[PDB]
């Protein structure tokens, strides 16, 4: 069975026993792969259009995993009688065989290639995947009929992208396989916005052996680390014959809930599949190579003890790697057909050096079972991969297709339905941090990008997702916003309006006051002869009345939008009149008492000293202070209108003249209070002992009206009433002036128009002396 004479021979290196070569357990995979090779050879012989006349033979040899690797190569490279000449140019060495269908394991493949490179003898492998085998400098005569490992990693990552998984765990074995695959997966994931929770190394072990306590402790710690994290997608890079202990340990605890992404090594294995209790740990997805039915093969295969035992399994599976051997044999056959230059029915024998076949092998192109067999520049043929879910019920196959992968496009396609383990057939969830709500920004936590915290922004700041999502920009301009608001609602200002009832109330209170003074103005004028008018000091009294009309004429500057044009008058014009108004009353009190008190208490000089410097100049000096303090106040401050924020609600704001602050308001109500108190003291001194024309009585009365308004305003302003400061000051402003209009002259209007008891010149002349 392991020999067939022919004009041209082929080599074969399969691992029939792997666990002298005939001392280990049997492996049927080697047997059916060898049968595939033999079937390919016989079929190529049967046809009468591929190679007319030229027959083919084979020479098969066992390898026993990485045990036997040097003897077969020396056997193949030998003319005859087991003698291999050594020289410096093998351009005319006719080796025993023409090509070698390389071994399965990667290490054996490398070992054999490092030997066959000298003679440039083509070697096609069928189950070894490693990026290191794509370097044509080290391996100039090695080809492969299956894809490399980066394609497996790409399929894994595309599966992890289709369903939203960005939080995974990785486990690797302790050997080149696991280390290389894990490093490659990490490099791939780093560029696709996916995270790795941690990584671990499984202790290397074998079934049917006794383990030390340290390794059991290691497994316990690994399973605990698994059953402490939030990641629920585990990717395992390890070969079979090592995972039994790990899975038993995981079963001993109560770890349930995970998606186990396997690799080619244990994606299709019956011995581990048979563990029934494994059913209840989650979904099992693996990456494998697409199967291709081969017509007329089971007849050859069935027509040894281990094969019958798993004949059912070899029917369900096992057709995933035989196509590789089939295609490799047919590729060698086509290359030989091209090299010899044969035709449909004619052939010409000729010496064939092995190094020549490589050139024609590099450029074959044909169709086999509706698959194109051509080699890429790195020595590969692109065959579709598959993702297989593990199904337990024995009715249908134990490995069910769920998707397809196309190497020439790097895309997953034709994704079918999968039966998960969740409650209502939902997609298992794996993520580190939850998505943020509307308006909230991102606060980083840890070294992984995909983990973060959600932070809500405070008022006055808006979060523009189109810009940095880790910090919300402050709302500029007059726009305003509050908690969790990407958009602002720019605010509003207010000032003393018209329809407001308090403004109307002040209007009536001011108006009736203004009318009263005007009626007094005509009355104090057309009666210029009666002593009451002359008893007021003369025209000096008229100057006082007029300045009060202006004051009440200055009520409307307080109503309307606030600006510098009006803010100036509110600061300079309005308070100018007030100080003189009280001063004339104060100096009047000086007249009542001092003019005769000091003229009778200090007649030595007072009689002549005050004779020339009348009270007018004394009042003027009080004024001179008023301008000085005023101009200082304006210079100390500015005329720019002031804006404030309403505590009642952010949407409202307040604009008012600069002295709106009580501290600035008190700036001018200091000398005014001083003038008030000194006048009050003098008036009370001559309350009733003198009866000049009954003026002390009123002066004390109007002074009291001023004081209650002043003390009331300060006390209330010590508590504040929201947006009422403007109105209250105006109400006091109109009220304190009224104390003058109907508290200093109104009664004197009565005497002139009601009682002539003072109008008679004789009567007043009598009271003047007294």
């Amino acid at each position: 069975d392991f020999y067939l004479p022919g004009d041209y021979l082929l080599g074969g290196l399969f691992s029939l026993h792997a666990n002298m070569c005939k001392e280990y357990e049997v492996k049927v995979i080697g047997y059916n792969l060898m049968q595939a090779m033999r079937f390919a050879v016989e079929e190529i012989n049967n046809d009468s259009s591929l190679l007319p006349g030229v027959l083919l033979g084979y020479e098969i040899v066992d390898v026993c995993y990485i045990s036997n690797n040097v003897q077969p190569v020396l056997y193949f490279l030998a003319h005859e009688d087991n003698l291999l000449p050594i020289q410096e140019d093998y351009s005319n060495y006719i080796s025993r065989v023409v090509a070698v269908i390389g071994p399965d394991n990667s290490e054996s493949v490398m070992t054999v290639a490092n030997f066959l490179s000298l003679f440039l003898l083509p070697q096609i492998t069928y189950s070894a995947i490693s990026d290191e085998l794509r370097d044509k400098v080290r391996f100039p005569a090695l080809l492969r009929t299956t894809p490399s490992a980066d394609h497996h990693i790409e399929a894994m990552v595309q599966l992890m992208l289709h369903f939203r998984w960005n939080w995974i765990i990785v486990l690797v074995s302790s050997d080149t396989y696991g280390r290389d695959n894990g490093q490659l997966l990490g490099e791939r994931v780093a560029r696709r916005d996916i995270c790795i929770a941690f990584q671990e190394t499984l202790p290397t072990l074998q079934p049917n052996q006794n383990m030390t306590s340290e390794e059991r402790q290691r497994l316990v710690t690994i399973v605990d680390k698994l059953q402490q994290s939030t990641a629920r997608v585990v990717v395992v890079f390890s070969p079979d014959l090592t995972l039994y202990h790990f899975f038993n340990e995981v079963l001993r605890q109560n770890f349930t809930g995970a998606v186990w992404i396997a690799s080619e090594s244990w994606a299709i294995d019956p011995v581990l599949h048979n563990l029934t209790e494994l059913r209840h740990l989650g979904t099992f997805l693996g990456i494998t190579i697409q199967s291709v039915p081969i017509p007329g093969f089971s007849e050859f295969r069935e027509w040894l003890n281990a094969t019958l035992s798993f004949n059912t399994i070899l029917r369900l599976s096992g057709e995933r790697v035989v196509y590789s051997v089939y295609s490799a044999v047919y590729a060698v056959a086509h290359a030989l057909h091209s090299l010899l230059g044969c035709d449909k029915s004619t052939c010409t024998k000729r010496v064939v050096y092995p190094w020549q076949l490589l050139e024609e092998i590099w450029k074959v192109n044909f169709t086999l079972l509706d698959h194109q067999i051509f080699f890429d520049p790195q020595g590969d043929v692109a065959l579709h991969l598959e993702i297989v879910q593990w199904q337990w019920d024995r009715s249908q196959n134990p490995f069910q297709s769920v998707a397809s992968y196309y190497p020439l496009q790097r895309q997953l396609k034709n994704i079918q339905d999968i039966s998960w383990h969740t409650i209502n057939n939902t997609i298992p969830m794996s993520m580190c941090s939850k998505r943020c709500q509307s308006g909230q920004k991102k606060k980083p936590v840890g070294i992984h990008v995909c983990c973060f915290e959600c932070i809500d922004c405070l008022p006055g700041t808006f979060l523009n997702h189109t810009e940095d999502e880790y910090e919300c920009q402050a709302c500029p301009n007059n726009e305003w916003s509050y908690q969790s608001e990407t958009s602002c609602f720019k605010r509003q200002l207010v000032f003393l309006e018209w329809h407001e009832a308090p403004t109307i109330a002040v209007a009536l209170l001011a108006a009736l006051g203004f009318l009263s003074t005007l009626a007094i103005l005509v009355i104090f004028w057309r009666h210029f002869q009666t002593p009451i008018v002359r008893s007021a000091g003369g025209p000096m009294c008229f100057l006082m009345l007029t300045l009060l009309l202006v004051a009440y004429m200055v009520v409307p500057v307080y109503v309307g939008p606030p600006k510098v044009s009006t803010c100036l008058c509110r600061q300079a014009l309005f308070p100018l009149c007030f100080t003189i108004c009280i001063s004339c009353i104060a100096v009047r009190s000086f007249q009542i008492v001092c003019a005769f008190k000091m003229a009778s208490r200090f007649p030595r000089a007072y009689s002549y000293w005050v004779r020339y410097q009348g009270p007018y100049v004394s009042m003027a000096f009080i004024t001179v202070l008023k301008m000085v303090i005023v101009v200082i106040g304006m210079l100390a401050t500015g005329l720019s209108p002031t804006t404030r924020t309403d505590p009642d609600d952010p949407k409202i704001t307040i604009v008012s003249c600069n002295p709106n602050y009580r501290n600035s308001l008190l700036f001018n109500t200091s000398l005014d209070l001083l003038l008030s108190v000194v006048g009050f003291s003098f008036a009370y001194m001559g309350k009733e002992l003198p009866t000049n024309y009954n003026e002390a009585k009123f002066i004390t009365l109007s002074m009291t009206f001023y004081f209650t308004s002043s003390v009331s305003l300060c006390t209330f302003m010590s508590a504040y009433s929201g947006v009422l400061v403007t109105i209250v000051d105006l109400l006091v402003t109109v009220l304190n002036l009224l104390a003058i209009s109907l508290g200093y002259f109104g009664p004197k209007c009565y005497m002139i128009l009601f009682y002539p008891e003072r109008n008679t010149p004789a009567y007043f002349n009598s009271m003047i002396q007294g």
Binding site: I66, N69, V70, Q71, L74, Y75, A78, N82, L83, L84, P85, I86, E88, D89, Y90, S91, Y93, T111, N114, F115, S117, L118, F119, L120, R138, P140, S174, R179, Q183, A190, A197, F198, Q199, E200, T201, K225, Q228, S229, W355, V445, G446, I447, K687, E688, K697, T700, L701, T704, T708, V711, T715, F716, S718, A719, S721
Partner: protein, 782 residues
């Protein structure tokens, strides 16, 4: 020269050799590549082996009577060219062919041993081929852990320490100095990958585990190097281990110097700990400490003079003629300067030792004693393998022994970089035989105060914190204690749920506990004092009641009003007794029966005082005709008419305010930490001002009508008391406005209490007391 012709000498037993004699500066035919460029290191090592063989031949104790030989070859550091001589060594003696058999024991090799190559890459390739035939192979430069396995390399020995010992020493240094938080980096060659694979397990088995494990790309004719450093800088690690070849380290340090990186403690390997390239990089002084391990070993002292003499001899025309009686055709035209660069290389000794070992093994297998020894069949190569394990062979007066795995044992020295100017120097501060021995007072660190740099983690978070797991292999924890606003519900589930609304809890709290209702209680120190004053307040008011109702018919009281005075007097006591409703636990009735039931009597009494003041105003200011009319009118029921009018107004105002904004009980929680505050809430001064409107108006109307009346000449006046009484009310309610808004919230109920007690006291000391004082002395006055 005639050097190239001295690479083959005959003898009874011949050794084989493989050195990188030459270098070579796309395969279409099966031909061996040709190397031409000359490398001096291979020539130096070959001459070292030649010296060893000559020395062995000269001696008498070793192999007495037998003559050794050698057969050197070139490898070009390429497997393709190194395989051919290897295939030659194992061939039938005196033939040019090799035979394929099922096993060894059927071969007749033309060599006895091979001094293997200097490269691990070629060592792995050639060892597998040799192990089939059991041909002992001794290597002088290969240092890789993967070659210690005896299942794939049965017949491999090396005279250079493996890479496991250096990493073990590094791990022990890290542990002894106390560095749990580190970062491991390695090159992209097999060197770095194997180093990382070993060190990960070594560290994980000692308590050290890494923050990042990365690879540094090789300079194969820059972007990835940026990413690697960013991760390192993002983990706050002051210690970095670099296991890389010279080129990767040079690239990494050039990049680091180009930009700015904070100094860190770099733990090096032997590749770049003694390389002039790295030492000569400008700006290297601004990176920190550099420690490492360097092996201790003797050095051949006669090698330079030996090479001088043999070069001079080769120059002799006569010798070349006799010598005749090409593996390296490019080493025949070299001069002393071409080889003077490395006549102190620290590996000639290794080759020396290698040769000696093989010789000794043969001496033991032949069973030779002192001067002559038995005649037998020639020893086969596979026989020596039994005597090579546990073989004590003396080289340069330094005993050496092979182990089961085939390695030799050597010590180490801990080297530190010190700067004196711009030239680095190597100093010794440690030793490593099997356990590290370190000196700490001879190290100059890179910190400001010359203090040990620190890199540590925490492996157990104290009870009362949430632990966030960090690390590549998930070892260490970052401990955070949530503030005084949440519990620690579970050790896992890293989050601190906020306390319950009723609950109070400090920082580092396992749970949030219940709170306590807060309200001014009846027994508070403030309340008692306010109640003690209440006893005095009631006491004095009643006494005036005991007087006015006693001298009711006296002329003095008659002027006051008699019965009218009493009604005001009794009413004052009631409002005083209305001072107890405030404190204690709020109740809906006491909240709504607090304000309207307190100010109502006051307006019931300020009418009484007003009737008197208006009486004084009738005569003092009004004309006679109106004065008589008012005197005879107000004296009658008009007094009680005004009282009823005031009572009706006050109730109407209270009812309006009651419906407008009825006070209600409210609970405040966040004002104070550990007590939930329940207290009655009002609305600004709207309720206050409305209830204060009547007594404010009537009190003023009394003040203006009696402040100006002239004092009675030489007699008590009825205007002084009212004027002084009314100003007492005004100041009390004016004075407490700033207070009630600027005191503690809880005492807010306790200030409204005072206003009435202070208000009533003044009135009793202004208008009623003077009548009582005179009345008490009335019998004595007259």
């Amino acid at each position: 020269l005639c050097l190239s012709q001295q690479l083959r000498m005959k003898g009874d037993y011949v050794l084989g050799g493989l050195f990188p004699l030459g270098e070579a500066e796309s395969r279409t035919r099966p031909s061996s590549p040709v190397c031409t460029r000359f490398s001096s290191n291979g020539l130096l090592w070959a001459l070292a082996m030649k010296m060893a063989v000559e020395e062995i031949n000269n001696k008498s104790d070793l192999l007495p009577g037998l003559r050794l030989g050698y057969d050197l070859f070139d490898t070009c550091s390429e497997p393709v060219v190194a395989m051919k001589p290897s295939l030659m060594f194992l061939a039938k003696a005196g033939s040019r062919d090799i035979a394929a058999y099922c096993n060894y024991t059927q071969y007749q090799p033309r060599v006895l041993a091979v001094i293997g190559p200097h490269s691990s890459e070629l060592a792995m390739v050639t060892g597998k081929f040799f192990s089939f035939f059991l041909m002992p192979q001794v290597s002088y430069g290969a240092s890789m852990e993967l070659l210690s396995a005896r299942e794939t390399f049965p017949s491999f020995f090396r005279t250079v320490p493996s890479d496991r010992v250096q990493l073990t020493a590094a791990a022990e240094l890290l542990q002894e100095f106390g560095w749990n938080w580190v970062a491991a980096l390695g090159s992209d060659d097999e060197y770095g990958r194997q180093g990382l694979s070993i060190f990960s397990a070594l560290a994980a088995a000692r308590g050290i585990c890494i923050a990042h494990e990365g690879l540094v790309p090789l300079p194969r004719a820059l972007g990835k190097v940026q990413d690697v450093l960013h991760q390192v800088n993002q983990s706050s690690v002051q210690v970095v281990l670099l296991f890389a070849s010279v080129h990767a380290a040079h690239a990494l340090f050039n990049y680091s110097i180009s930009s700015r990186l904070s100094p860190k403690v770099w733990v090096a390997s032997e590749a770049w700990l003694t390389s002039d390239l790295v030492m000569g990089l400008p700006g290297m002084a601004q990176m920190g400490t550099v420690l490492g391990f360097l092996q201790r070993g003797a050095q051949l002292h006669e090698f330079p003079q030996y090479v001088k003499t043999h070069l001079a001899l080769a120059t002799d025309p006569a010798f070349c003629s006799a010598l005749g009686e090409q593996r390296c055709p490019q080493c025949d035209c070299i001069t002393l300067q071409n080889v003077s660069a490395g006549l102190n290389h620290h590996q000639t000794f290794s080759v020396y030792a290698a040769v000696y070992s093989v010789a000794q093994a043969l001496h033991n297998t032949l069973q030779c004693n002192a001067s002559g020894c038995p005649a037998q069949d020639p020893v086969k190569p596979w026989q020596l393998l039994e005597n090579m394990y546990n073989l004590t062979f003396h080289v340069g007066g330094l005993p050496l022994r092979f182990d089961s795995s085939g390695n030799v044992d050597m010590e180490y020295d801990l080297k530190l970089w010190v700067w004196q100017g711009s030239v680095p120097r190597l100093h010794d501060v440690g030793r490593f035989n099997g356990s590290l021995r370190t000196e700490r007072l001879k190290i100059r660190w890179h910190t400001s105060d010359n203090q040990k740099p620190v890199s540590r983690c925490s492996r157990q978070c104290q009870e009362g914190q949430v632990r966030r797991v960090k690390g590549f292999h998930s070892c260490c924890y970052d401990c955070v204690d949530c503030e005084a606003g949440s519990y620690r519900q579970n050790p896992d589930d890293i989050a601190c749920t906020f306390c319950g609304q009723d609950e109070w809890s400090p920082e580092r709290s396992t749970r949030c506990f219940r709170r306590r209702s807060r309200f001014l209680a009846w027994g508070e120190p403030a309340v008692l004092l306010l109640l003690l004053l209440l006893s005095l307040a009631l006491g004095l008011v009643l006494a005036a009641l005991g007087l006015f109702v006693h001298h009711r018919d006296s002329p003095l009281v008659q002027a006051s009003g008699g019965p009218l005075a009493c009604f005001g007097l009794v009413c004052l006591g009631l409002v005083c007794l209305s001072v107890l409703l405030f404190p204690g636990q709020p109740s809906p009735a006491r909240c709504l029966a607090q304000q309207p039931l307190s100010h109502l009597p006051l307006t019931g009494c300020l009418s009484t005082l007003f009737l008197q003041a208006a009486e004084i105003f009738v005569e003092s200011e009004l004309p006679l005709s109106w004065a008589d009319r008012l005197s005879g009118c107000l004296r009658g029921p008009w007094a009680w008419l005004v009282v009823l009018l005031a009572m009706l107004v006050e109730v109407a105002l209270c009812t309006w305010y009651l419906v407008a904004f009825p006070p209600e009980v409210v609970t405040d929680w966040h004002m104070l930490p550990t007590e939930a505050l329940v207290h009655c809430r009002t609305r600004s001064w709207v309720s206050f001002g409305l209830a204060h409107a009547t007594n404010a108006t009537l009190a003023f109307l009394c003040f203006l009508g009696t402040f100006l009346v002239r004092s009675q000449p030489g007699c008590y006046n009825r205007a002084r008391g009212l004027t002084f009484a009314m100003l007492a009310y005004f100041i009390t309610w004016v004075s407490f406005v700033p207070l009630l808004a600027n005191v503690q919230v809880v005492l807010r109920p306790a200030v409204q209490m005072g206003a009435l007690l202070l208000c009533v006291l003044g009135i009793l000391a202004a208008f009623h007391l003077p009548r009582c004082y005179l009345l008490m002395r009335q019998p004595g006055l007259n």
